Design an enzyme around this catalytic site. Structure first.
Site, PDB file in Angstrom:
ATOM      1  N   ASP A 139      27.844  28.608  15.420  1.00  0.00           N
ATOM      2  CA  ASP A 139      26.910  27.687  16.053  1.00  0.00           C
ATOM      3  C   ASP A 139      27.629  26.364  16.321  1.00  0.00           C
ATOM      4  O   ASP A 139      28.857  26.261  16.247  1.00  0.00           O
ATOM      5  CB  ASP A 139      25.663  27.517  15.186  1.00  0.00           C
ATOM      6  N   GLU A 179      16.932  29.458  23.733  1.00  0.00           N
ATOM      7  CA  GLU A 179      18.036  29.422  22.782  1.00  0.00           C
ATOM      8  C   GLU A 179      19.136  30.432  23.081  1.00  0.00           C
ATOM      9  O   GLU A 179      20.271  30.230  22.639  1.00  0.00           O
ATOM     10  CB  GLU A 179      17.515  29.660  21.361  1.00  0.00           C
TER      11      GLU A 179
END
Ligand code: UKA
EC number: 3.2.1.17
Length: 441
Positions: free
Chosen positions: A214, A205
């Site tokens: 994000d 990630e």
């Protein structure tokens, strides 16, 4: 064997080698687009610098060894170019090392901080600063048989040591080494870190040390630690301070991210245990395989993981190989194969191998800096050490002559070896070089 005729012949052989070895590098990157990353932009610059030394710095360094009479500024000029042409090579090496530093330790921001546009701007610096130092004596920091306004053209005659030792050596050659060395170790230490769940999900990630949006425009920090859906960055920052417990300015350390990550893991586990379908499988797995299951939760969600009824069954029966094949047929494997592949292997082996393998790229770069720093220091330290003794101990017993000129030979050997060695060691060049050799030769 006439004493110096040997010396000149070596310098000329270096000229050819320096040219030839470097003509290849820039040529390969020209015709292969895989080698057209921002990093190789730094390479082509170093290669060009090392070409310039083969044509001008070498014949100049040679002609500074005869002692003919000429204007002090006309002989200083020559010694200044060989200085300038070499300063560039030193700084050009920094550009590569630091580039390789960020690419390894900070891979996300790499493209942000390291654009093909900026890079070309950093080379402009490296070249201008090279002029600034090499041409310092021309500004007035110089030392001025034969006639008026004519000195024996010899390096030490026109370049004082208080320049070579204090300014040039310490500020221009030494702090590279110390810097380039720090790069090697910190890269090296990154490739050999003890693996765990935190590092595991840092690879899949990615770790973030400053707040970021994000994929859906929600402020996030760390490894996917969302702060708030509010559209206020100031609001997000406020929430960060609440979790960190200090004034963050929107930035946290690596250890603080691990405390946020650990709190997130503790939360995912408590949810897994509440799930009637995931708790039986979670209890029957060793520590490392539990990290693989948590990795699937942090990506899909508990209900998404629970969907793998069959693959979850085989795991509790410890049919590792059988669960792996079944996971390979999932849409999850089809939508993100790289991550799913590393996760599945962790299920198969119960080890960190799949992620340990990810660091093979890191150790390759580390071993490639050991060489650049080792040669660079091997080639540069000798000559400059000699300068120091002459400057601090004139009455000492000077070192042997023949050896002194070797140290000069070592300094110039850097230009042919250093750029080519980095390229040849990264194979994409090797295949490109052979292609050129056979096609045109
Ligand atoms: C990173 C920045 N760039 C560089 O460092 C580049 O600049 C050049 N350079 C850098 N220090 C250099 C340098 N040191 C100084 C010099 C020296 C040291 C002590 C005493 C006198 C001179 C030296 C010369 C040779 C080898 C190393 C250093 N002498 C030369 C350069 O040609 N000398 C050649 C022309 N002179 C001479 O034979 N003299 C002779 C040397 C022998 N005798 C000695 C020796 C000991 C004690 C007394 N008498 C009489 C004078 N060139 C250099 C070289 O190309 C480097 O790559």
């Amino acid at each position: 064997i006439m004493g110096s005729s040997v010396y000149i012949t070596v310098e000329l052989a270096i000229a050819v080698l320096a040219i030839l070895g470097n003509v290849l590098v820039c040529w390969a990157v020209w015709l292969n687009s895989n080698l057209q990353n921002v990093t190789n932009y730094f390479v082509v610059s170093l290669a060009a610098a090392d070409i310039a030394v083969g044509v001008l710095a070498i014949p100049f360094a040679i002609t500074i060894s005869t002692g003919f009479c000429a204007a002090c500024h006309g002989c200083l000029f020559i010694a200044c170019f060989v200085l300038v042409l070499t300063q560039s090579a030193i700084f050009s090496l920094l550009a590569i090392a630091i580039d390789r530093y960020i690419a390894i330790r900070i891979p996300l921001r790499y493209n942000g901080l390291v654009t093909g546009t900026r890079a070309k701007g950093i080379i402009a610096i490296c070249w201008v600063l090279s002029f600034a130092i090499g041409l310092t004596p021309m500004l007035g920091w110089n030392n001025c048989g034969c006639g008026e306004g004519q000195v024996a053209c010899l390096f030490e005659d026109v370049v004082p040591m208080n320049y070579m030792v204090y300014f040039n050596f310490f500020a221009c050659v030494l702090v590279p080494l110390l810097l380039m060395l720090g790069v090697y170790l910190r890269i090296f230490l990154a490739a050999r870190r003890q693996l765990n769940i935190f590092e595991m999900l840092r690879i899949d990630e990615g770790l973030r040390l400053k707040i970021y949006k994000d994929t859906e425009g929600y402020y996030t920090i760390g490894i996917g630690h969302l702060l708030t859906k509010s559209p206020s960055l100031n609001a997000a920052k406020s929430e960060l301070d609440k979790a960190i417990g200090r004034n963050t300015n929107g930035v946290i350390t690596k250890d603080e991210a691990e405390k946020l990550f650990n709190q997130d893991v503790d939360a995912a586990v408590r949810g897994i245990l509440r799930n009637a379908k995931l708790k039986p499988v979670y209890d029957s797995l060793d520590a490392v395989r539990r990290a693989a299951l948590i990795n699937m939760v942090f990506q899909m969600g508990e209900t998404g993981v629970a969907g793998f009824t069959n693959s979850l069954r085989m795991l509790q029966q410890k049919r590792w190989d059988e669960a792996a094949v079944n996971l390979a047929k999932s849409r999850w494997y089809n939508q993100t194969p790289n991550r799913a592949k590393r996760v599945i292997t962790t299920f198969r082996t119960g080890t960190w191998d799949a992620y340990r393998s990810t660091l093979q790229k890191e150790v390759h770069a580390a071993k490639s800096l050991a060489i650049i720093v080792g040669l660079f220091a091997l080639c540069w330290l000798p000559l400059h050490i000699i300068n120091c003794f002459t400057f601090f101990c004139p009455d000492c017993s000077h070192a042997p002559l023949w050896l002194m000129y070797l140290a000069i030979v070592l300094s110039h050997t850097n230009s042919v070896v250093n750029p080519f060695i980095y390229a040849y060691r990264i194979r994409e060049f090797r295949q490109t070089f052979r292609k050129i050799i056979r096609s045109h030769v």
